[PDB]
Amino acid sequence: GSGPPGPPGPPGPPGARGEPGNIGFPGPPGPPGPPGRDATDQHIVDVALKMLQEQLAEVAVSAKREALGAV
Amino acid sequence: SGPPGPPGPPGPPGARGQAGVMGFPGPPGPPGPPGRAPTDQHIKQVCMRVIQEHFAEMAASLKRPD
Amino acid sequence: SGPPGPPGPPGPPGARGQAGVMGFPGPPGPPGPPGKEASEQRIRELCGGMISEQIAQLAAHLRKPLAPGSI
Shortest distance, CA A18 to any CA of chain B (angstroms): 4
Q: Cβ(A42)–Cβ(C43) under 8 Å? A: no
Q: Establish if A18 belongs to a structural domain.
A: no
Coil, strand or helix at A50: helix
Q: Cβ(B49)–Cβ(A50) under 8 Å? A: no
Which experimental technique did the depositors report for determining this structure? X-ray
Q: Establish if A69 belongs to a structural domain.
A: yes
Q: Cβ(A38)–Cβ(B36) under 8 Å? A: yes
Nearest 10 degrees: CA dihedral of A4, A7, A8, A12?
Answer: -130
**Contact residues on chain B for A11, CB-CB shorter than 8 A:** 8-12
Helices (H) and strands (E) in chain A, counts: 1, 0
Contacts for C58 with CB less than 8 Å, ≥ 6 apart:
B55, B58, B59, B62
Contacts for C34 with CB less than 8 Å, ≥ 6 apart:
A36, A37, A38, A39, B34, B35
Q: Cβ(C23)–Cβ(A27) under 8 Å? A: yes
Coil, strand or helix at A25: coil
Shortest distance, CA A68 to any CA of chain B (angstroms): 13
Helices of type H across chain B:
40-52, 55-63
CA C18 – CA C23 distance, rounded (Å): 15
Q: Establish if C48 belongs to a structural domain.
A: yes
Total number of domains constituting chain A: 1
CA A13 – CA A19 distance, rounded (Å): 18
Resolution stated for this PDB structure, in Å? 1.9
Amino acid at B3: P
Amino acid at B23: G
Q: Which domain holds residue C43?
A: 38-66
Contacts for B59 with CB less than 8 Å, ≥ 6 apart:
C58, C62
**Residue ranges of the domains in chain B?**
38-66
CA distances from B21 to A4, A26, A29, B26, C5 (A): 55, 11, 19, 15, 44
Q: Establish if A9 belongs to a structural domain.
A: no
Mutation target to probe the A interface, by most A beta carbons within 10 A, among B47, B55, B57 is B47
Count Cβ neighbours within 10 Å for each residue of A44-60 and write b for 16 or more, e otherwise: bbebbbebbeebbeebe
CA B62 – CA C58 distance, rounded (Å): 8
| N-to-C CA span, chain B | 144
Contacts for C71 with CB less than 8 Å, ≥ 6 apart:
none
Total number of domains constituting chain C: 1
Q: Using alpha carbons only, what angle is made at residue A15 by residues A10 and A20, rounded to the nearest 5 degrees?
A: 160
Q: Cβ(B37)–Cβ(A39) under 8 Å? A: yes
Q: HSE-up of A24 (CA within 13 Å, CB side)?
A: 18
Q: Establish if A44 belongs to a structural domain.
A: yes
CA A12 – CA A24 distance, rounded (Å): 35
